[PDB]
From a paper:
Of these are a class of multi-protein ABC toxin complexes (Tcs) that have multiple receptor binding domains on the shell of the A subunit (TcA) for recognizing and binding target cells. The Xenorhabdus nematophilus TcA, XptA2, has thus far only displayed toxicity to insects. Here we report the high-resolution structure of the Xenorhabdus nematophilus TcA XptA2 by X-ray crystallography and cryo-EM, each at 3.1 Å resolution. XptA2 forms a 17.5-nm-wide, 24-nm-long pentamer with a molecular mass of ~1.4 megadaltons (MDa).
We then used our 7 Å map for iterative MR-SAD phasing to successively locate the selenium atoms in the X-ray diffraction data, which resulted in the final electron density map to 3.1 Å resolution. During the process of refinement with full non-crystallographic symmetry (NCS), we observed that a small domain of chain D was out of density (2mFo-DFc), which was confirmed by inspecting negatively (−3 σ) and positively (+3 σ) contoured mFo-DFc maps. We determined that enforcing full NCS except for constraints on residues 1363–1506 (RBD-B) produced optimal refinement of the model (see Section 4 and Figure S3). An examination of XptA2 crystal packing revealed that RBD-B of chain D is packed against RBD-A of chain E of another molecule. A direct comparison of the X-ray and cryo-EM structures revealed that the break in the five-fold symmetry of RBD-B of the X-ray structure results in this domain being pushed slightly inwards toward the shell due to the lattice packing. One difference between the two XptA2 structures observed was a slight shift in the positioning of RBD-B (residue Ala1310–Lys1591) in chain D. When compared to the cryo-EM structure enforced by 5-fold symmetry, RBD-B on the X-ray structure exhibits a slight indentation with respect to the outer shell. This subtle difference between the position of RBD-B on all chains is likely due to lattice packing during crystal formation. It allows visualization of certain degrees of flexibility in the domain. This dynamic movement indicates a “pop-socket” interaction between RBD-B and the XptA2 scaffold. We observed Arg2190 from each protomer orients to create a ring of five inward-facing arginine residues at the second narrowest point (2.7 Å) in the channel; the transmembrane region at the tip of the channel creates the narrowest point (1.5 Å). Unknown density was measured in the center of the arginine ring, apparently coordinated by the positively charged amine groups of the five arginine residues. We expect the density corresponds to a counter ion in the crystallization buffer because we do not measure density at this position in the cryo-EM structure.
Numbering used by the authors:
A (entry chain C): 1319 to 1562
B (entry chain B): 1514 to 2001
C (entry chain B): 1 to 147
D (entry chain D), G (entry chain C): 2148 to 2245
E (entry chain B): 977 to 1367
F (entry chain C): 1124 to 1220
H (entry chain C): 977 to 1025
I (entry chain A): 1807 to 1854
Write the structure that this text describes.
């Protein structure tokens, strides 16, 4: 039986390569036993193609300041992001706020000038420097995809700041590039092994198998593909409603 | 007047004084020299992969010092080798898979896709040209197992100056040394995960089992218990990873062993149970796979388009690309391109530039097939609008605008010229400078394996090179759409 | 049957104290390579180095094309939904800045396919068709061309 | 119909090969035995070549006649355009006449 | 020129250099450097002499999509050419294209369901050269195909798809016995060799006894892709000898190897076993034939049979762990090392275009591996010196 | 063929039936021993053929009936394949005495 | 396709000759022997004559259609030249009219 | 558009909704409902457009 | 000699200029002939 694929919530994650390669039958005495062998599927963090895919997953994929990981943390991200203004349309600061570590991760595609000073500015106006609520310089001036250590719990301030500005100078104002925010979404990337389950129904009986008990080998905990393979699922099919 | 040969370290010289059979007539016309049989002791040749060179030089110099004639040549000496581990043999599993084995490596020889196409063809051809059919699994190549490996993000501190990695196989056959098994490149943003097949036979694994380790240069994790060790357990009748963690006692190929340490280099190593690999678009059957799933639908699309059967043509091109997605099991599929090798960007030609062939280049980088298919869809939309435009009715004109607007929305906003005004005009000798050409090629060669950017920015005044040019076919699409919308 | 590292060592250095690289032999024909290095290289070694240089030349050409194809601003683009940035693409941009994105319209002198680019290729290869001693040398009959 | 003829010509290749295989088996028995047709396989391979040639000629006629109809339509298009110009030209002459 | 005609500085420079290149390459101006004039740019001068053609070949690497034609491509399968012919009409119904596609699927199944039956490697070792295969159709019809692969491309057991070659059908009426058909290369062209079994009886015997007659057939691929009329030889005595008069319960096996050094084809007939002893004398399980360049044959005696004993490692064997058949590819034979039988040096031009060396070659090159030292002998090495300038 | 899943109370719609299609593959069955069968997901035709043969090298020449089982399948383009053949003479004589 | 048909017709000559040689061998044995087809070689030579004629006819048709296409192009060129002269003539009439 | 081109209220409404449907099905506007876009009307959009 | 010339003439009659040059270069080429990566000493590539 080939299960196929499915798209997760908010176009943030995908489920791939689900199938049951072998299904056997056994009619001993007067009860029928069905065995599903090597049932498997894979979960992977991947958007089906939009701003959410390219730049929000890559922001989470960045290594934290405390050292790597960042997987299993809670995030708040923009529902839809668009380019608004600035000197040029760079990759555009795509900011993601890490709730559990109070981080801000921004991602770009290109930078305008290496010599010119660049930092982050989050402001609910765009053209007003003195209305900002966040500002972090780049650790090397020539770098994209960094994390900035807010330091406190400033989720409310972050939700106030639309217009993520990556130009961020005071040689005048010098907005190199800025992006919109639209809505905001709350997501938790932590997965519980008891919540990764295969469930089957044979008439009145219900069998449930989770990753805690019936998993052969647990996959590596990461943002990339995590293939789960289960032990043989033994199903008591003796209460089936046989119509015709 | 001498003939000289070189066989490895030894050098033999034969001159006209000693080794001439008969000297030719002394004249300004043809002077043919014929030598006695030249006996060469070829016992110090450097045999690399059972082949060694023999250098032969004919030289004749006048007392002036002028070279009257010099010819250099190299002879290839091939060593016969019929050792059983170096002989190709063919086996056929009971599942129907044929593979050819040369030592450790096994290569699939046939395909079993035809039988599974019969049931799909019982329904319409809509069922044959799907992603599911292109992901159908193949039976394994004889006895063995599949192992899953995960490698870290690129780390210059741990890995080194370059991001490449090599995976080697260990105790197979009789060789205890490292043999190359897989190669690839580390990613700077995420991890890389792979699934390799390790062959097995009775008595094929040596002490403690097989090794699979990863090397990076500046480190090579093949010390004691650093590579992944696998063995076949005769009791459980399954393959077991020996060193998934530290173990004060564990079973191996040679009985119990004492100090087991976890593998190093890999983030995670495990055994894929009951795993069958999907068909490979780079195998010996790649040509027939590509024709079935890409080349044939595009040919039918083009022929129907040439005969103005627009609706039927759309059905065929949607088997490979559809901007609105693909309905599978009553849901929009997650993949963008319905043709699997395009979605995965599978290269299947290693030498595209050996001859002038546009298809060979596209086979090396199937990205160009994405663009070619995309432009074909733009051609259909514009032709649809042009024919509707010519019907002159209000409904026809509204239809024409719809097609043109949809074409413009797929293209997006056409970009401006960015590099022309910043370009410093060089001299003719400056652009043809060998030093400029060599410096750029040095960076390209380094980039092809590493990515070292010490003193990153290349000091813009350090450029006399030319810039990439936009595709004139795409700018013509935008030019056409602008003119059509203006007239409407 | 040879090792390119050893053969490059047998010719090293390239008169500038550096390990003579494969890119430095772009550049000259097989006859030139055999003639200039007639002492250090055998016929087989000259063939091996010439063949390896051409394959390096082709691979570098392909790598540049792979980067430019995905960096093209024209493909953004509903086709951009199925375009991914390679790790080598980011390394190229860190080194060359905005070069990968500095596309020019056809008909511009800065294009690599412009008549100026064709003139550069003609001058590069036809420059050495005669020795500097000959009055038929390109830079002797027309000294203005070089400037 | 020409396309059908080409398909039918190729449809006899499998039968021709099978006949040569069948006729290689001896067909007389007893204390005088034999009867195999030695050249049955060679004749079958010669037959499929002839059938291949016939199918190719039928396909060529189909494509040739098809393109003849297409060039015929192209001439009709020029004739239509010429007639359209005649009407437009004569309507301009009417303005001059009045 | 008249003042009326106009140009640009870059266009005039291109025109001037193009004229200079033509004069230099065509020996119109003396002292042209012959080494420089052989650069790859000047070899391709037929397309580099014009701005239009030079731009075409340079843009192909960067924008191949501008030249891709969905109806023609280098490497298009014969079955794809057939599909194009079936939809070359001007009225294409939806059902017409479906029917043409179903015909294509019929061809696809025939080629896809092929199974390899034998292989030959055209070298004395498995490091370089081409490996040739013969395939068999699943359908109950004696149809056989062939292809080859270049394994010198191999790196760590992985093979690029372009190293493989299309399956090509053999049209020569082959009816082999069991699976005794294999390819072989000698006289530098592909040959097909197989055995056929027919039922014959001895004439003039009151108890009429029928027996199986085994015939060895050999045909070669001609220049235009057609196959020649096969040579035939009777090998009934050898077949009964090596099978102990039990060809039905044993597996008769065929092996063919090209001895290029002596311009001969070595054919071996043997009983499939688990291992093989040396050839000749006490071992009656292996028989041999020698086929010469003109089609004649010489049945092998014990003296010549022992000469090719080490070829037993290329024979088919039976696996010890379960009775699984493991076919092995035959290899080209050489004594101990393979060295080319000749080498032509060619010619060279002397200093100042004053002298030339002509007709340099070594007609004969032999090898000798006695004890553990290899001896190579160059026979009748010759060259000519003459006073002459190259025109 | 006919689709009998359409059946309601023993009544069958006409469109549930399929056109008669001619078989062009040179079938010469013995008596009425020919039937269709489906395996490998495609239609197969299986039948037996009877030929008159004699055993070689026997002074009293005894003729016997040879029974051959043939199996062919329908291909993608509607043509029929070359049939597989097997000898079933021993089985036929045993069950028919 | 017509060129392919001619080649396929010629491709059966070698097989036809081989069939005639094969069928000259007697095929029945015992105390009744023989079975050679005496005229097998003569029939084979008659067959290659027929295939030669068929191949010639296919080749002639290929060249005949090819030259018909060439003369058709020559007529198109004259039509193009006439139309070009028409435009030049009318542009001169515009000078006269103004 | 110029003032010269004319239309009707129903015709313009049809043209506008057709433009919106094309933008939604072709992933040009975000947050498009993937469940609604699989209705029989939008699957047959090749003839319903 | 005769076959390469025949191919040259037929390609020339069909205006396939580049392909015709390849065939006529088998007998004569004013720019010489490349043998073993060097310009051959002979003027005409056709031996007779």
């Amino acid at each position: 039986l080939n299960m196929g694929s499915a798209i997760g919530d908010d176009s943030l994650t995908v489920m791939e390569n689900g199938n049951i390669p072998q299904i056997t039958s056994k009619y001993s005495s007067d009860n029928l036993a069905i065995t599903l062998h090597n049932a498997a599927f894979t979960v992977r963090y991947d958007g089906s193609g939009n701003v959410i895919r390219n730049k929000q997953i890559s922001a989470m994929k960045l290594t934290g300041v405390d050292g790597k990981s960042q997987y299993g943390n809670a995030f708040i991200i923009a529902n839809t992001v668009k380019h608004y203004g600035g000197y040029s349309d760079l990759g555009g600061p795509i900011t993601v706020y890490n709730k559990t570590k109070n981080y801000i991760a921004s991602v770009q595609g290109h930078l305008m000038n290496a010599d010119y000073t660049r930092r982050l500015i989050l402001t609910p106006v765009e053209n007003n420097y003195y209305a900002r609520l966040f500002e972090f310089p780049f650790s090397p001036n020539t770098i994209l995809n960094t994390v900035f250590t807010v330091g406190s719990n400033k989720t409310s301030d972050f939700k106030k700041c639309s217009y993520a500005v990556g130009g961020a100078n005071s040689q005048g104002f010098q907005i190199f590039s800025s992006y919109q925010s639209s809505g905001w979404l709350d997501i938790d990337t932590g997965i519980n092994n008891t919540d990764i389950k295969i469930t089957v129904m044979a008439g009145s009986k219900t069998h449930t198998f989770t990753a805690s008990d019936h998993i052969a080998s647990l996959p590596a905990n990461s943002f990339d593909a995590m293939p789960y393979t289960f032990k043989p699922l033994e199903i008591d099919a003796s209460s089936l409603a046989f119509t015709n | 007047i001498k003939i000289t040969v070189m066989a490895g370290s030894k050098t033999h010289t034969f001159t006209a004084s000693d080794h001439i059979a008969s000297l030719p007539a002394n004249s300004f016309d043809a002077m043919p020299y014929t030598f006695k049989p030249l006996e060469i002791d070829a016992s110090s040749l450097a045999f690399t992969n059972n082949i060694a060179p023999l250098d032969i030089v004919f030289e004749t110099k006048a007392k002036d010092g002028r070279v009257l004639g010099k010819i250099k040549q190299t002879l290839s000496v091939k060593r016969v080798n019929y050792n059983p581990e170096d002989i190709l043999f063919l086996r056929e599993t009971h599942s129907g898979a044929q593979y050819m084995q040369l030592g450790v490596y096994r290569i699939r020889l046939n395909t079993l896709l035809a039988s599974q196409l019969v049931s799909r063809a019982n329904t319409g051809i809509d069922t044959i040209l799907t992603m599911e059919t292109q992901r159908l699994p193949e039976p394994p190549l004889g006895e063995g197992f599949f192992a899953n490996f995960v490698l870290p993000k690129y780390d210059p501190a741990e890995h080194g100056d370059e991001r490449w990695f090599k995976i080697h196989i260990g105790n197979v056959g009789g060789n205890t040394g490292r043999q190359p098994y897989y190669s690839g490149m580390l990613s700077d943003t995420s991890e890389t995960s792979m699934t390799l097949f390790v062959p097995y036979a009775e008595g094929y694994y040596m002490h403690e089992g097989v090794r699979l380790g990863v090397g990076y240069q500046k480190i090579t994790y093949d010390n004691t218990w650093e590579s992944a060790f696998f063995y076949f357990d005769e009791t459980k009748q399954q393959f077991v990873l020996i060193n998934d963690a530290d173990h004060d006692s564990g079973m191996t190929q040679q009985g119990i062993v004492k100090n087991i340490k976890k593998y190093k280099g890999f983030l995670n190593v495990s055994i894929a149970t009951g795993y069958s690999a999907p068909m490979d678009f780079n195998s010996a059957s790649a040509l027939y796979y590509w024709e079935l799933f890409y080349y044939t639908p595009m040919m039918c699309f083009q022929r129907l388009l040439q005969e103005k059967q627009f609706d039927e043509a759309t059905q065929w091109i949607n088997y490979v690309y559809n901007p609105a997605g693909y309905i599978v099991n009553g849901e929009i599929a997650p993949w963008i391109w319905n043709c699997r090798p395009l979605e995965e960007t599978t290269s299947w030609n290693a030498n595209p530039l050996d001859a002038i062939d546009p298809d060979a280049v596209a086979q090396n980088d199937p990205m160009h097939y994405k663009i070619a298919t995309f432009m074909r869809l733009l051609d259909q939309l514009i032709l649809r609008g042009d024919m509707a435009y010519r019907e002159l009715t209000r409904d026809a004109l509204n239809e024409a605008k719809m097609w043109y607007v949809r074409t413009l929305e797929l293209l997006g906003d056409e970009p401006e010229d960015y590099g022309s005004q910043q370009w410093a005009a060089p001299s003719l000798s400056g652009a043809a400078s060998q030093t400029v050409q060599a410096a750029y090629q040095q960076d390209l060669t380094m980039l092809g394996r590493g990515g070292v950017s010490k003193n990153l920015r290349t000091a813009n005044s350090l450029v006399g090179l030319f810039l990439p040019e936009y595709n004139p076919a795409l700018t013509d699409y935008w030019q056409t759409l602008r003119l059509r919308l203006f007239n409407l | 049957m040879y090792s390119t590292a050893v053969l490059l060592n047998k010719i090293s250095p390239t008169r500038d104290g550096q390990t003579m690289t494969l890119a430095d032999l772009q550049y000259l024909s097989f006859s030139e390579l055999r003639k200039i290095f007639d002492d250090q290289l055998s016929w087989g070694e000259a063939r091996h180095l010439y063949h390896e240089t051409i394959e390096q030349k082709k691979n570098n050409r392909l790598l540049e094309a792979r980067i430019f194809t995905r960096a093209n601003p024209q493909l953004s683009g509903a086709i951009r939904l199925g375009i991914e940035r390679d790790s080598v693409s980011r390394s190229y941009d860190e080194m060359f800045g905005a070069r990968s994105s500095s596309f020019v319209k056809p008909g511009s002198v800065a294009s690599m396919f412009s008549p100026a680019g064709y003139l550069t290729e003609l001058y590069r290869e036809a420059k050495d068709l005669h020795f500097s001693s000959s009055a038929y040398h390109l830079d002797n009959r027309r000294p203005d061309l070089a400037d | 119909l020409l396309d059908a003829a080409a398909g039918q010509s190729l449809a006899g290749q499998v039968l021709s090969i099978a006949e040569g295989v069948a006729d290689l088996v001896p067909n007389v028995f007893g204390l005088a035995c034999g009867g195999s047709r030695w050249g049955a396989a060679l004749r079958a391979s010669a037959s499929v070549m002839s059938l291949s040639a016939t199918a190719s000629q039928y396909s060529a006629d189909k494509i040739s006649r098809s393109e003849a109809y297409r060039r015929r339509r192209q001439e009709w298009e020029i004739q239509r355009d010429n007639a359209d110009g005649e009407v437009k030209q004569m309507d301009a002459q009417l303005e001059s006449l009045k | 020129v008249s003042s009326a005609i106009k140009t640009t500085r870059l266009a005039e420079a291109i025109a001037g250099i193009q004229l200079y290149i033509n004069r230099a390459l065509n020996r119109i101006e003396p002292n042209a450097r012959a080494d420089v004039s052989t650069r790859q740019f000047f070899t391709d001068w037929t397309v580099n002499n014009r701005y239009s053609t030079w731009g075409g070949v340079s843009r192909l690497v960067y924008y191949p999509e501008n030249y891709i034609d969905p109806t023609q491509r280098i490497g298009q399968t014969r079955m794809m050419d057939e599909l194009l012919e079936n939809i070359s009409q001007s009225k294409l119904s939806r059902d017409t294209v479906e029917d043409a596609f179903k015909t294509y699927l019929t061809r696809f199944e025939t080629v896809a369901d092929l199974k390899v039956v034998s292989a030959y490697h055209d070298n004395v070792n498995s490091n370089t050269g081409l490996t040739w295969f013969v395939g068999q159709t699943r359908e109950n019809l004696p149809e056989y195909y062939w292809r080859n692969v270049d394994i010198s491309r191999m790196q760590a057991g992985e093979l690029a798809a372009n190293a493989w070659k299309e399956w090509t059908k053999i049209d020569t009426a082959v009816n082999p016995y069991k699976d005794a058909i294999r390819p072989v290369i000698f006289r530098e062209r592909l040959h097909l060799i197989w055995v056929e079994k027919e039922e014959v009886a001895k004439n003039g015997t009151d108890p009429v006894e029928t027996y199986d007659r085994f015939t060895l057939k050999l045909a070669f691929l001609r220049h235009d892709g057609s196959w020649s009329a096969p040579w035939s030889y009777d090998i009934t005595t050898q077949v009964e000898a090596v099978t102990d008069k039990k060809p039905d319960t044993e597996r008769l096996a065929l092996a063919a190897s090209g001895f290029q050094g002596e311009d001969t084809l070595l054919v071996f007939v043997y009983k499939t076993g688990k291992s093989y002893s040396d050839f000749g004398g006490s071992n009656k399980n292996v028989a041999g034939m020698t086929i010469y360049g003109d089609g004649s044959f010489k049945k092998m005696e014990n003296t010549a049979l022992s000469r090719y004993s080490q070829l037993k490692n290329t024979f088919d064997i039976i696996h010890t762990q379960g009775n699984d058949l493991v076919r092995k590819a035959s290899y080209r034979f050489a004594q101990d090392f393979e060295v080319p039988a000749s080498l032509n040096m060619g010619s060279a031009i002397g200093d100042d275009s004053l002298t030339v060396m002509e007709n340099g070659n070594i007609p004969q090159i032999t090898s000798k591996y006695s004890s553990d030292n290899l001896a190579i002998t160059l026979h009748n090495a010759a060259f000519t010196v003459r006073y002459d300038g190259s025109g």
